[PDB]
Design a protein around this motif. Sequence first.
Motif, PDB file in Angstrom:
ATOM      1  N   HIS B 221       0.902  -1.185  -0.142  1.00 20.16           N
ATOM      2  CA  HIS B 221      -0.069  -0.013   0.020  1.00 20.16           C
ATOM      3  C   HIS B 221       0.749   1.209   0.049  1.00 20.16           C
ATOM      4  CE1 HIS B 221       0.707   0.103   4.433  1.00 20.16           C
ATOM      5  NE2 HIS B 221       0.574   1.300   4.345  1.00 20.16           N
ATOM      6  N   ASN B 222       2.005   1.113  -0.026  1.00 22.39           N
ATOM      7  CA  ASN B 222       3.039   2.316  -0.109  1.00 22.39           C
ATOM      8  C   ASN B 222       4.050   1.913  -1.293  1.00 22.39           C
ATOM      9  OD1 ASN B 222       4.319   4.584   0.233  1.00 22.39           O
ATOM     10  ND2 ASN B 222       5.224   3.940   2.406  1.00 22.39           N
ATOM     11  N   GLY B 223       3.652   0.444  -1.933  1.00 24.80           N
ATOM     12  CA  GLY B 223       4.584   0.189  -2.946  1.00 24.80           C
ATOM     13  C   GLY B 223       4.762   0.800  -4.056  1.00 24.80           C
ATOM     14  N   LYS B 224       3.884   1.754  -4.601  1.00 22.18           N
ATOM     15  CA  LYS B 224       3.939   2.371  -5.709  1.00 22.18           C
ATOM     16  C   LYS B 224       5.156   3.533  -5.559  1.00 22.18           C
ATOM     17  CE  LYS B 224       1.894   1.828  -8.789  1.00 22.18           C
ATOM     18  NZ  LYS B 224       0.887   2.395  -9.292  1.00 22.18           N
ATOM     19  N   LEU B 226       7.425   2.977  -3.433  1.00 24.77           N
ATOM     20  CA  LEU B 226       8.560   1.921  -3.490  1.00 24.77           C
ATOM     21  C   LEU B 226       9.649   1.990  -4.688  1.00 24.77           C
ATOM     22  CD1 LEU B 226      10.083   0.175  -1.240  1.00 24.77           C
ATOM     23  CD2 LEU B 226       8.848  -1.890  -2.452  1.00 24.77           C
ATOM     24  N   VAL B 227       8.839   1.653  -5.618  1.00 25.04           N
ATOM     25  CA  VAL B 227       9.503   1.002  -6.722  1.00 25.04           C
ATOM     26  C   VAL B 227      10.567   2.224  -7.263  1.00 25.04           C
ATOM     27  CG1 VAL B 227       9.307   0.355  -9.119  1.00 25.04           C
ATOM     28  CG2 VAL B 227       7.753  -0.563  -7.145  1.00 25.04           C
ATOM     29  N   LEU B 228       9.847   3.395  -7.421  1.00 27.08           N
ATOM     30  CA  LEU B 228      10.465   4.689  -7.748  1.00 27.08           C
ATOM     31  C   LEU B 228      11.630   5.208  -7.034  1.00 27.08           C
ATOM     32  CD1 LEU B 228       7.294   5.810  -9.747  1.00 27.08           C
ATOM     33  CD2 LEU B 228       9.614   4.917 -10.557  1.00 27.08           C
ATOM     34  N   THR B 229      11.597   4.585  -5.667  1.00 33.83           N
ATOM     35  CA  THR B 229      12.651   4.953  -4.934  1.00 33.83           C
ATOM     36  C   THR B 229      14.086   3.898  -5.117  1.00 33.83           C
ATOM     37  OG1 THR B 229      11.062   5.597  -3.294  1.00 33.83           O
ATOM     38  CG2 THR B 229      13.543   5.238  -2.529  1.00 33.83           C
ATOM     39  N   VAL B 230      13.523   2.782  -5.525  1.00 30.78           N
ATOM     40  CA  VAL B 230      14.571   1.871  -5.830  1.00 30.78           C
ATOM     41  C   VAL B 230      15.049   2.322  -7.251  1.00 30.78           C
ATOM     42  CG1 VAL B 230      15.157  -0.524  -6.273  1.00 30.78           C
ATOM     43  CG2 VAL B 230      13.617   0.117  -4.523  1.00 30.78           C
ATOM     44  N   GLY B 231      13.972   2.559  -8.153  1.00 28.23           N
ATOM     45  CA  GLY B 231      14.384   3.295  -9.363  1.00 28.23           C
ATOM     46  C   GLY B 231      15.250   4.495  -9.319  1.00 28.23           C
ATOM     47  N   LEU B 232      15.167   5.135  -8.392  1.00 30.80           N
ATOM     48  CA  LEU B 232      15.874   6.403  -8.156  1.00 30.80           C
ATOM     49  C   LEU B 232      17.166   5.783  -7.777  1.00 30.80           C
ATOM     50  CD1 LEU B 232      16.228   9.417  -7.689  1.00 30.80           C
ATOM     51  CD2 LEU B 232      15.706   9.038  -5.176  1.00 30.80           C
ATOM     52  N   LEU B 233      17.436   4.544  -6.670  1.00 30.18           N
ATOM     53  CA  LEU B 233      18.689   4.225  -6.455  1.00 30.18           C
ATOM     54  C   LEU B 233      19.343   3.643  -7.634  1.00 30.18           C
ATOM     55  CD1 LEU B 233      18.903   2.242  -3.179  1.00 30.18           C
ATOM     56  CD2 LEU B 233      19.967   1.170  -4.986  1.00 30.18           C
ATOM     57  N   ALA B 234      18.436   3.199  -8.607  1.00 31.52           N
ATOM     58  CA  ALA B 234      19.158   2.637  -9.759  1.00 31.52           C
ATOM     59  C   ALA B 234      20.070   3.744 -10.647  1.00 31.52           C
ATOM     60  CB  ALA B 234      18.112   1.988 -10.757  1.00 31.52           C
ATOM     61  N   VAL B 235      19.212   4.902 -10.519  1.00 32.62           N
ATOM     62  CA  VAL B 235      19.621   6.003 -11.044  1.00 32.62           C
ATOM     63  C   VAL B 235      20.973   6.902 -10.318  1.00 32.62           C
ATOM     64  CG1 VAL B 235      19.107   8.169 -12.033  1.00 32.62           C
ATOM     65  CG2 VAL B 235      17.595   6.104 -12.542  1.00 32.62           C
TER      66      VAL B 235
END
Lengths: 237, 378, 107
Positions: B221-224, B226-235
């Motif tokens: 429920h906070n997972g949307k 979540l991904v973009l944070t990790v997607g941030l970490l990818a960047v």
Amino acid sequence: TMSVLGHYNNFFFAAHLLDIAMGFKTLRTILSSVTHNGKQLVLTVGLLAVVVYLYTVVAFNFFRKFYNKSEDGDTPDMKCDDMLTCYMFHMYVGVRAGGGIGDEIEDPAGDEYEIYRIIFDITFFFFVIVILLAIIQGLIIDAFGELRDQQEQVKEDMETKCFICGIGNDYFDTVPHGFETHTLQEHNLANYLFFLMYLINKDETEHTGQESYVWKMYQERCWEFFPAGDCFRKQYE
Amino acid sequence: AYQQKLLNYFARNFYNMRMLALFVAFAINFILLFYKVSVHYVLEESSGYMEPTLRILAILHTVISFFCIIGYYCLKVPLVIFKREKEVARKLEFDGLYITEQPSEDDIKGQWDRLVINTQSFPNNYWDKFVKRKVMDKYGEFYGRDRISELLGSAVLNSIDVKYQMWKLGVVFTDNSFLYLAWYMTMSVLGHYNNFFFAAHLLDIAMGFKTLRTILSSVTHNGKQLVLTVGLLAVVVYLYTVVAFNFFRKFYNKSEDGDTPDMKCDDMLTCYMFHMYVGVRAGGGIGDEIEDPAGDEYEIYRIIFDITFFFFVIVILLAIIQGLIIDAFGELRDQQEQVKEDMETKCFICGIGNDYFDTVPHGFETHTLQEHNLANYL
Amino acid sequence: VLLTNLSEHMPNDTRLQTFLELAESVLNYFQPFLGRIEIMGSAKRIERVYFEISESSRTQWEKPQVKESKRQFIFDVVNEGGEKEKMELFVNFCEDTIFEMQLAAQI
Ligand SMILES: [Zn+2]
Ligand SMILES: [Zn+2]
């Protein structure tokens, strides 16, 4: 019985220190910081038992040849493939890593499986080490916020509503400095304790009329007698 | 007679039919703990008939996963299909969407239901069979009287409405719950073909244990974000592997010393794969697994590259996904705090509030248990 | 007790107020001792009943562990207590804590 065994062996004698479970008053809060959220604690770790098990399934086919606790193959090369001890590897090491399980393994250097190796291991570092341990991080932290809230609910619903009468702070601000008086003179919880003492302490012949009423009401357990809404001030003008 | 009578068993037994499937999935996978190689093999430090009990239970499990979804087909499938007819029915009555709106290309779920309205059977499970004529008498003379009546209207092989039934399964298949149990059954199918991928049934714990569903909800429920944070970490990590791609190329040695055929991991593909397999995964930043400097011109630029990478990634960004999950607790805990606050304040229908019903002695409880008491309006 | 009852039923009588402040030294002696509550004594206008707080049970209420048990009770209600059972829990608090002190008085 741990003190009994002290006369039989003065070592297990000193496991009395888990009196600190119920000893120091202040420390009981910090151990309560877990166990009031502890039911969902276990299942999270029980989740971690299961999710790690699924990673030790993946390696059980696909990355069996990468396990070497042994030096180099030169030594009598332990390749830790057995699903029992493989899952015991992933918990003694992969759960316990600090840096994911790809720290204690043959890290790849040009394999077909290298892409599948890292992706196995990046996710295991996230889905276990990063995210699941942060749960039990945050689960304990919410437990603070779950207990802090409750102590915030107390000293809010004590100060709003006088406990018996259900009223609220507002009505007793009409009187100057009033709510304090209403909670320290008009209901003042201890008096209903003390009154209840007064009734139990005397005989039913010795009851006054208000009290012989009340006693009948009490043995009935009918509980009308406590002021629901209309405590004395609100009855009049 | 047996096919409809025993049909009523599975629907009756279903949550036991589904939980017991998970408990069987426990004990099977408790024995997939006991494998080893030699070709794959089952060592037995137990009774010798344990591999027959695996052949017993694995067939038994696939038996359960078939006979339970038949119960699912008569427990929740009818409810879902109730709901789907309902949405169409009221939107013909109050929107007239297949008369007027002609639904948009997205949510073909909407577009799927165009066919069924021609059928006789259309509102079967809606208890309200007057839908179809009502729409006629709301939208006949406005748009077309028998243009819309045209829109609407051994022995087993042609007794049923084909168009209804093809519609039905089309909605049944697009149920995420039915597709789940189907995806759970096809893993049981492959158990008879290979008793290994058979044990990936344990992600029933996604929807199994009630209590555990909270803790998996603690993420998604906070997972949307979540991904973009990790997607941030990818960047952000990608930008550090850009800096090293010029400035600190000579410091990469997975290899021993240069004495070995010295792998210097410079290639931007595998360099970024280094920074994720190591630098993200470090525990101590990437300057742990690298030639740490000992007197270079770049030493000042080396540490400053690496102090920041330890902070901006390891310290701060992982703490996000730390705290992001933790806020999700505080985001869900709040919501459960909102419930039992706005239930206790305002009586649900009447909007009033607690205060008005404290005039009466012990009153709000009465007002919520006699005067509206939700179930009565049900 | 009675002078309290004259006042607190019927205030704003200077007649009484003169008389009550003349009785001052008495009231101060019994202000710890007079208990006072409210109930609904079947006229259903709320009466107030005055009684005697015993000095043993007075003192024993505050000191050790009842002090902890009191706020323990309050956190038993405000955390998890329902509406009906609130007053029903209350005496279940009380009767226990009454029995506590009755032990702790005979020590
Ligand atoms: Zn009150
Ligand atoms: Zn209402």
